[PDB]
Design a protein around this nucleic acid. Structure first.
Ligand SMILES: [Mg+2]
Ligand SMILES: [Mg+2]
Ligand SMILES: [Mg+2]
Ligand SMILES: [Mg+2]
Ligand SMILES: [Mg+2]
Ligand SMILES: [Mg+2]
Ligand SMILES: [Mg+2]
Ligand SMILES: [Mg+2]
Ligand SMILES: [Mg+2]
Ligand SMILES: [Mg+2]
Ligand SMILES: [Mg+2]
Ligand SMILES: [Mg+2]
Ligand SMILES: [Mg+2]
Ligand SMILES: [Mg+2]
Ligand SMILES: [Mg+2]
Ligand SMILES: [Mg+2]
Ligand SMILES: [Mg+2]
Ligand SMILES: [Mg+2]
Ligand SMILES: [Mg+2]
Ligand SMILES: [Mg+2]
Ligand SMILES: [Mg+2]
Ligand SMILES: [Mg+2]
Ligand SMILES: [Mg+2]
Ligand SMILES: [Mg+2]
Ligand SMILES: [Mg+2]
Ligand SMILES: [Mg+2]
Ligand SMILES: [Mg+2]
Ligand SMILES: [Mg+2]
Ligand SMILES: [Mg+2]
Ligand SMILES: [Mg+2]
Ligand SMILES: [Mg+2]
Ligand SMILES: [Mg+2]
Lengths: 122, 129
RNA sequence: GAGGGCGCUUACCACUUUGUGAUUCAUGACUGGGGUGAAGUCGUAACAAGGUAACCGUAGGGGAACCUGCGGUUGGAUCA
RNA sequence: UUAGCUAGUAGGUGGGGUAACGGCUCACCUAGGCGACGAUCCCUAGCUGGUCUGAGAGGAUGACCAGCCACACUGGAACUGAGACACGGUCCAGACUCCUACGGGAGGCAGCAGUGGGGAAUAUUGCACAAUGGGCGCAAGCCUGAUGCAGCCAUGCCGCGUGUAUGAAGAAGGCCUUCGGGUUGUAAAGUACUUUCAGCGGGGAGGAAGGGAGUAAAGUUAAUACCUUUGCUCAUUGACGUUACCCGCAGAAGAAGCACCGGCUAACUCCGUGCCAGCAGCCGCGGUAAUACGGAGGGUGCAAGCGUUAAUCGGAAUUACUGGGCGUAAAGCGCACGCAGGCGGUUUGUUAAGUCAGAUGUGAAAUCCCCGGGCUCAACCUGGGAACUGCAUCUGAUACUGGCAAGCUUGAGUCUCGUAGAGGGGGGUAGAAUUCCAGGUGUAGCGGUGAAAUGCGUAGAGAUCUGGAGGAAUACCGGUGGCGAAGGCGGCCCCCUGGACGAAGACUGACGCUCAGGUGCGAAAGCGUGGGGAGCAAACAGGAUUAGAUACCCUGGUAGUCCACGCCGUAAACGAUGUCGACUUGGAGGUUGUGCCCUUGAGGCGUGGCUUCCGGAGCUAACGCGUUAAGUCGACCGCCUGGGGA
RNA sequence: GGGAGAAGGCACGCUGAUAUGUAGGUGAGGUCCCUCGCGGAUGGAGCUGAAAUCAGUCGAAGAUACCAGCUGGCUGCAACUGUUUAUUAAAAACACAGCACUGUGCAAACACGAAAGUGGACGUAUACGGUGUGACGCCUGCCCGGUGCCGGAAGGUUAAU
């Protein structure tokens, strides 16, 4: 309000927390799968979206989402967690970037292969 | 408690212009007369006069041009509690030269343009447009 | 002989040891509340004068929304 | 949501010690020093020039380089040395590793390369002292994992190329197709043309300056000896180096991919499932075609890069100093007093702290910007200028703020005469009425409800009269009447007392406003002690309604509501509108005082305080405020930053 | 108010200096004054006399003998001091201040008393007796169905006479 009140109590900021706490300012984090399963998204959406509870190497254990169509993930699988949330999945805050150590690219895809780790067809 | 006479003068003249008054009598002061001299020189007012022996009273005459008031906006700048001191380089310009940004300095209170011409800074008093 | 070296001792002093406090983290049988949800069970408390006008402070009572008394407001509709 | 810390600690006296000043340290004396302008404590963090975002203000940040600081497996210490408590110097303690003939000994790559481990992620166990320095040496000369270079990585910036003029049967094929045509498309084939860049064969500057071997003159010197300087031609020195650069070879070859296409946002048509696969940054899409999923055609954008992820800022005026609000979206403390603090009516004199102008020192270099130059050009480098918005010093101004002094009443306050008021505290008294106690008449009902019943009655209920007891408040007055800071106050009288307003005066002289922290008051309800208790009435019982009613309808009924002394500071404590000063059209009233005119009637004109309703400008998102503003400003405090969690 | 002497730790002998005995206490003689004695101001002669600092010194051991707390944490009970079965139970058992009920208007209730009389009490409902629980904080929620106590005599039964 007044200049004297501003001098007394400074016009402080408002710190906002990140939406990817388990990354600790890192683009990708290597982790090991712990629980591979499928969950039903919140209404009005309805599906069997494939998610994975994975414990990162730093110690954090989160749940990520598997994109594309078809994957070869199971227990004791090394994946590369990437930062990104799914709006229609309560709790999911991360994805698994394809083309990594074990999560191979999507089969029979020829468009947007950069986001799914698919090699250039011959 | 009346803690600012310059603000009172600006409020009185601004309300008189809004109400289409002819004269606005008020208790005057040395700085009030100095500011009224600048207003007369710049033509924003019509006339100012100090009439009083023991308690001097300034009776400014409002100036109207085809119904519209000559002064568009009157604004106090260096109000008591927030003092503004700008050098010659950073002297303000009101309405791109169409308004006055009155500055008080060592060589009296002439105006912003005269302060720039003389090459000395000062404190801003009133923005009149 | 002066004086200097070796040894010894005193003072400072690192590692270490004893007792009791303060703070933080993790864990802990069990336990209270809150937020999420799918055709789950009970009631209709608020929104009209919501059908007992609502709401606030307080005290008591009840499976629950809530009820009652006290003090204040119309952010209630009609009307001598 | 860190209010006290410090006993060598504040200071002093005297001595000893470093290069010097120094509680740097001991021996005595005075108990001080720090702290609401944040001491102490906790977490995190190398600082700066700079860097990125932003018009600026600001926000984040410390890659490379440069300056400073701190550290060499960890802790402690000292010696040499001008310069260290010292990265590859010393000793000891702790751990690790490695020999031992078991008495015993050796080491510290957060140096240059490289290894193991961690991670999403970091590069060769390369050449040379040729140039610049550094160290040593008279000089030659030696070393330098500094440095000058070499290799890998699209990690970042910039440049070039991956062709070109064409070339219509709008070849063929593909795509859909209203099956007539369109798209790809001058695209492709074919033709003419060029050979950048890559490969081959050659030439080929420049970073190299000096140094030694010889010859002369001068400077010396007893002396052309010896040495220095000045020159002089010759014989000399390159990791880069397959150097930059240029020349001829021949052929279009050896070189384009990535993301998106519903809106934000630049770009639409078919096929395949069928809330399934799935997309997703928000709006949201998939339930027989959703231009939104996957495939195709086509187009869009960038380009040796294209997208995602990680982090900062703009937009976000969404922390607002520039640049916001608090009546209703979140926001005036319930009110008052008041400290520190903030601000401050009017005139003059003095000073020049704040302010202003000039000059000096400085603000390293590097970096941004402007003017130019060199690599074919840009990136890159470079010269000058500007800038570094800052600080200190010196010289001049007092218009303003502040320091001091001397004046004024217009702010504030006092006295004098009067006025209104449920203002507060304490004590008395009158009356209606309700409820009981006793008695006299008095007979079958009374009370209650939408309907009844619990309940009261022949043990005389209900009704009336008489006498007595007890508690509360005061019918009409009574009104958007009055007072009070707020909460709140209502028969009458007595005592104390606060506050408010008016004609005419006199007087001090800025003594004025706000106010975190603090202090006091403060509805009801609640709690403790001592009293009292008529009526009303939480809890509780019974009756009634309802499918159910732990409630609204009824009969009882305790706490409490009544008093004294104590505790809380809670309300929709509201005008959802903080305190003080000035200005801004008007109308119709209520209350209270005063002035004047012939007051023959509350006849007429004025003039202050409070309060009520409309209403102009203006304001507001609109309801609405509207002289008692939510209209324009001034001084201050408190509060707000999405809804839940709370 | 307390736990608390919490837990734990430091110094304790002797000698010499500060000081040939210090700080302190007691207190001589000589000036003084008297309204003169058991007097009033100076005075430290003498005696007694801690505590600490510094240095040295001897022993394994210096509160060296006797005397002279073991400590902490959780938990049930009773608030606590106290009292209790002389002579096997000292406790959670009784009492306690406080709280609640009831009776009691004085020639009071009650108790000892065939009675007089006395205590209560030479007190007067803030007094006394009896019964329950037993400092203090949150409280004492429902029932008179039954047995007691209190209020009534409308009705039935009802002795002596
Ligand atoms: Mg109120
Ligand atoms: Mg000392
Ligand atoms: Mg910003
Ligand atoms: Mg190391
Ligand atoms: Mg060092
Ligand atoms: Mg290395
Ligand atoms: Mg060299
Ligand atoms: Mg065709
Ligand atoms: Mg889209
Ligand atoms: Mg706002
Ligand atoms: Mg609301
Ligand atoms: Mg609100
Ligand atoms: Mg208020
Ligand atoms: Mg050029
Ligand atoms: Mg610079
Ligand atoms: Mg002045
Ligand atoms: Mg009360
Ligand atoms: Mg009732
Ligand atoms: Mg009932
Ligand atoms: Mg309020
Ligand atoms: Mg005030
Ligand atoms: Mg109005
Ligand atoms: Mg003595
Ligand atoms: Mg037990
Ligand atoms: Mg117990
Ligand atoms: Mg006991
Ligand atoms: Mg016994
Ligand atoms: Mg015992
Ligand atoms: Mg007992
Ligand atoms: Mg009981
Ligand atoms: Mg009974
Ligand atoms: Mg009886």
């Amino acid at each position: 309000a007044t200049v004297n009140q501003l001098v007394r109590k400074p016009r402080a900021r408002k710190v906002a927390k990140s939406n990817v706490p388990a990354l600790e300012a890192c683009p990708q984090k290597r982790g090991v799968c712990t629980r591979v399963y499928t969950t039903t998204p919140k209404k009005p959406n309805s599906a069997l979206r494939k998610v994975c509870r994975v414990r990162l190497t730093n110690g954090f254990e989160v749940t990520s989402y598997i994109g594309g169509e078809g994957h070869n993930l199971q227990e004791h699988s090394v994946i590369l967690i990437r930062g990104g949330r799914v709006k229609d999945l309560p709790g999911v805050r991360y994805h698994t970037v394809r083309g990594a150590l074990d999560c191979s690219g999507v089969k029979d895809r020829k468009q947007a292969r950069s986001k799914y780790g698919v090699k250039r067809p011959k | 408690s009346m803690q600012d006479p310059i603000a009172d003068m600006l409020t009185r003249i601004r309300n008189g212009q809004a109400a289409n008054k002819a004269a606005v009598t008020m208790p005057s002061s040395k700085l009030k007369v100095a500011i009224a001299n600048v207003l007369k020189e710049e033509g924003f007012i019509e006339d100012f006069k100090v009439e009083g022996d023991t308690k001097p009273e300034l009776e400014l005459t409002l100036k109207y041009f085809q119904g519209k008031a000559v002064v568009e906006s009157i604004q106090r700048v260096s109000r008591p509690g927030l003092r503004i001191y700008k050098r010659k380089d950073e002297l303000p310009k009101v309405m791109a030269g169409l308004g006055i940004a009155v500055v008080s300095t060592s060589k009296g209170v002439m105006t912003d343009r005269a302060a720039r011409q003389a090459g000395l800074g000062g404190e801003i008093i009133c923005y009149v447009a």
